[PDB]
Write a protein that binds this ligand. Structure first.
Ligand SMILES: CC(C)C[C@@H](N)C(=O)O
Lengths: 324, 323
């Protein structure tokens, strides 16, 4: 009697979900729904099933994990899947979450299913800690930094600069800003003080390195506001040391108690593989959604509504005995 | 609007009183002391003798037990829970299963809800231990205790012979902390994570100080740690060791299929441990108030409470601001 999981999208995240499931004995992978012609994408990968056949699994999948491979799926179609299954997604457009919730709630609701939106680390785990922090320390500041990680957008930008063969960009929290937050001295940070950007560029033969550097550093919207460093490297080093699959970040609540005493709470992640971690979180929440659906819960939910006890396959007593 | 009653007025109780002031949606109804009426009327303030607890029925939504004493809670807890929704910070991990059972039985009878073992540990750290092993099933969880007093160990020493008053500190080892943070995965011994430093005021007859080294051999308390010992005057203990600060770390180091290193960390750096613990109790009282109005009865732990219940903001507001 294991939890039957369905995967939609076979990009890095779906690949990770399939992986995570192996680390979860109480779960089985029923199928991987893809758009690519399964016929040519091998056949020994017995779990692969074409997206056109999704509906045929309406009764064999307990939780459908949406790992949409960037397109219309990775934002629009989950609503179509919620109409048929209990789902879990990591919709990451913070500004549009209120709307995504509205829509998903209606569907999952009248369909009698349950849909979990925006889980992962941010949104997801960082969200939970932002809430915990301001809930426990009502008087204070909340600072979220996004650990060393790539920005697809900024990388494409770098590529539009004259004389740039190829390149990559990283956003990195500034240590000095972290140290001050970690100290109880409450304060607000300017954009320039929280994060710095680091680019590794492969120049064309003869290109005007100093020009490229400034073209990137003074680039409006993307870099103008941040201290940016440009390192020039070869195509070999680019491929070897900048796969760009890692990430991390910090959530810090710097506050004071009534008497004025300093109190600091911090939560952070260091991810060698950002995608595999997100997937692991997706799977864990799948366990929670399964329980919830069985309890007969309906509508859309966020990690903000789920007790941590639901993320574990252990019983209530085992937890209170082992972890409390 | 949430009417809070404080039971006990030590450091935590004082802390709850202050924290209530940081919550516009909450009101302090009274502070219950064990002190004899033989005080000074009430000395003004919100102080009320414990004997009058019964009288506040239907005028208190949540009783926050700031008694401070695991053993006292064993009996007093059920007592209160039979009359009010309660919130305590029962900190004896080893006996939490028993406390839950007792509090559960009672609270269900009276139709009330009792939240036990909240605080930073048990409480917040328990939450992260769970989150940690839930997201990274394959890995190792390590908990450290920042640098501060370890109350229990402070009494165990006060029970020693030639000692009449003393204090101890628990201190994480930078070396252990870094390894944990390296996603290297491994097992640590008690002696590898923390060292103990004691400060004791002896002399019950200038008593044998070297036999006071019967503290370093104390089973379950020291001996498992490199325990450094010092002796001082009780003036040098009040104006030098008002150990209010404390902190800790919960590190989950693990690997996802394929061996990629994944590290999660939660830590606290508290200038005033008690006050922090107090803010946690209040935040959770809000959650208990809500569950209460929803009709939940019986005992619960932080593991059963959705984080959204700790905030006075609405669900739509949280999704918009924090999600
Ligand atoms: C839209 C995202 C996939 C990439 C964007 N956050 C960026 O880094 O530009």
């Amino acid at each position: 009697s294991k939890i039957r999981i369905g995967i939609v999208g076979y990009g890095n995240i779906g690949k990770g979900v399939e992986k995570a499931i192996k680390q979860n004995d109480d779960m089985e992978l029923e199928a991987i729904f893809t758009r690519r012609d399964i016929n040519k994408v091998d056949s020994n990968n017995s779990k692969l099933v074409h997206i056109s056949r999704l509906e045929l699994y309406k009764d064999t999948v307990d939780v459908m994990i949406l790992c949409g491979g960037s397109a219309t799926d990775l934002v629009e179609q989950g609503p179509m899947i919620a109409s048929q299954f209990n789902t879990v997604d990591s919709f990451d457009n913070h500004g549009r979450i209120p709307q995504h919730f509205e829509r998903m709630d209606e569907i999952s609701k009248k369909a009698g299913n349950i849909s979990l939106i925006s889980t992962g680390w941010d949104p997801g785990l960082f969200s939970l800690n932002r809430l915990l922090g301001e809930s426990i320390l009502p008087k204070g500041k909340t600072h979220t930094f996004w650990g060393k990680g790539v920005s697809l957008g900024h990388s494409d930008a770098i590529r539009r600069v004259q004389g740039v063969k190829n390149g990559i960009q990283y956003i990195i929290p500034i240590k000095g800003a972290l140290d001050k937050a970690r100290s109880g001295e409450q304060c607000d940070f300017t954009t320039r003080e929280k994060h710095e950007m680091v680019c590794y560029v492969v120049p064309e033969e003869n290109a005007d390195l100093k020009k490229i550097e400034q073209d990137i550093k003074t680039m409006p919207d993307y870099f103008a506001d941040y201290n940016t460093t440009v390192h020039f490297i070869t195509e070999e080093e680019l491929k070897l040391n900048h796969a760009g699959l890692s990430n991390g970040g910090f959530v810090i609540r710097s506050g004071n108690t009534q008497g004025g005493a300093k109190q600091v709470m911090e939560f952070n992640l260091n991810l060698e593989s950002s995608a595999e971690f997100t997937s692991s979180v997706l799977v864990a929440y799948s366990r929670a959604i399964y329980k919830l659906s069985k309890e007969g819960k309906k509508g859309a939910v966020t990690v903000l509504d789920i007790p941590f006890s639901y993320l574990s396959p252990k019983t209530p007593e085992e937890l209170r005995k082992e972890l409390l």
